[PDB]
């Protein structure tokens, strides 16, 4: 048993649905209301409880709209989630890392009392697309207290993430020509320590922009990872260990992990 558990006992179908069981409210954060980042939208459960909190960054030239579906879907499973805009859409990964940090702090300290009262500030995670995924890796390396990190088709010039101790799921796309998995996602995964909880899910038949529209697989494994690591929710281990089979056409190219994952 576990005091951080929220929602019903899961199934694959529950994780694959357009919405989880929680009712999602939205709070707008304008550019000038956000100290240290470009604003965003906070998605949060209307059900009064405390939940973990997650910040999600888009990539270069991207806005919060490119990750909105995923922020809302995650929130609907019982999380407080901010999808950010960056100070400029030209910001590099290490700047996005600090803006993700600022967005976590915003949710904890600067958002409405409705949002702040629903956050367990000790249980935080970060995610991001492309350069936002590079920023996710950088922030994970700077903040070992984070509970989870999910880089989506990540891009970063630094290939060595051996300092990261945060449970990290990297999602790559086999056809990606912008952040090719051979030179980005795979080197990142291979450099993460063998001794941390980590997984690499490479989508088959998928482009760099697979994370930017509703995707059953990305939603399912993102939610399961956050449940397992932000909530310590062992009801979600079954989806992650051993995880999906390799070689599923148009779905999963491969799934690697360090299963079993320690609490
Ligand atoms: Cl990018
Ligand atoms: Cl592509
Ligand atoms: Cl590899
Ligand atoms: Mg709603
Ligand atoms: Mg601002």
Q: Cα–Cα distance between 240 and 242 in angstroms, integer?
A: 6
> Helices 93-105 and 131-142, interaxial angle, to 10°?
60
* 3.40.50.1820, 3.40.50.300, 3.40.605.10, 3.30.300.90: CATH of 1-263: 3.40.50.1820
Q: Which residues have a Cβ under 8 Å from the Cβ of 172 and sit 6 or more positions away? A: 153, 154, 181, 184, 185, 186, 189, 200, 201, 202, 203
What DSSP element (H or E) covers 257? Answer: strand 252-257
Closest-approaching ligand to the CA atom of 184: 3
Q: Which residues lie at CB < 5 A from ion ligand 5?
A: 31, 34
> Which are the catalytic amino acids?
130, 176, 208
Q: Is 69 annotated as a binding-site member? A: no
Beta-bridged to residue 168, according to DSSP, are 149, 198
How was this model experimentally determined? X-ray
Q: Is 155 annotated as a binding residue?
A: yes
How long a stretch of residues is the chain?
263
| Cα–Cα distance measured from residue 104 to residue 202, given in angstroms and rounded to the nearest whole number | 28
Ligand 1 center–CA 201 separation, angstroms: 19
Q: What is d(CA 127, CA 99) in angstroms, rounded to the nearest whole number?
A: 12
- 131 annotated as belonging to a binding site for a ligand: yes
Q: Strand 198-203: give its sheet, edge to edge.
A: 24-29, 40-45, 80-84, 51-57, 119-129, 148-152, 168-173, 198-203, 252-257
Q: What is the rounded CA–CA span in Å between residue 109 and residue 252?
A: 39
Alpha-carbon gap, residue 31 to 53, rounded angstroms: 20
254 within 8 A of 200, measured Cβ to Cβ: yes
Strand ranges for 85-228 from DSSP E: 119-129, 148-152, 168-173, 198-203
Q: Which ligand is nearest to the CA of 90?
A: 1
What whole-number distance in Å separates Cα of residue 78 and Cα of residue 81? 9
Closest CA to 115 of 29, 32, 31, 39: 29
Ligand 1 geometric centre to CA of 154 (Å)? 8
Q: How far apart are CA 153 and CA 200, in angstroms?
A: 11
């Amino acid at each position: 048993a576990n005091p951080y558990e929220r929602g019903p006992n899961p199934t694959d179908a529950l994780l694959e649905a357009r919405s989880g069981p929680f009712s999602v409210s939205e709070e707008n954060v304008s550019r000038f209301g956000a100290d240290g980042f470009g604003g965003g939208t906070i998605y949060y459960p209307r059900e009064n409880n405390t939940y973990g909190a997650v910040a999600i960054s888009p990539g270069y030239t991207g806005t919060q709209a490119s990750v909105a579906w995923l922020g809302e879907r995650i929130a609907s499973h019982g999380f407080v989630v901010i999808t950010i805009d960056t100070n400029t859409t030209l910001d590099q990964p290490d700047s996005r890392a600090r803006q993700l940090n600022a967005a976590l702090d915003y949710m904890i300290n600067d958002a409405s009392s409705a949002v702040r009262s629903r956050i367990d500030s000790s249980r935080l995670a970060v995610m991001g697309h492309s350069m936002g995924g590079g920023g996710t890796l950088r922030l994970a390396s700077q903040r070992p207290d984070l509970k989870a990190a999910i880089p989506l088709t990540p891009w970063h010039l630094n290939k060595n993430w051996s300092s990261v101790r945060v449970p990290t799921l990297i999602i790559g796309a086999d056809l990606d020509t912008i952040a090719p998995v051979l030179t980005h996602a795979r080197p990142f995964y291979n450099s993460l320590p063998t001794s941390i909880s980590k997984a690499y899910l490479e989508l088959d038949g998928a482009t760099h922009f697979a994370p930017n529209i509703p995707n059953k697989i990305i939603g399912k494994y993102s939610v399961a990872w956050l449940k397992r690591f932000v909530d310590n929710d062992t009801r979600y281990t079954q989806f992650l260990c051993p995880g999906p089979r390799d070689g599923l056409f148009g779905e999963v190219e491969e799934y690697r992990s360090t299963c079993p994952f320690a609490l």
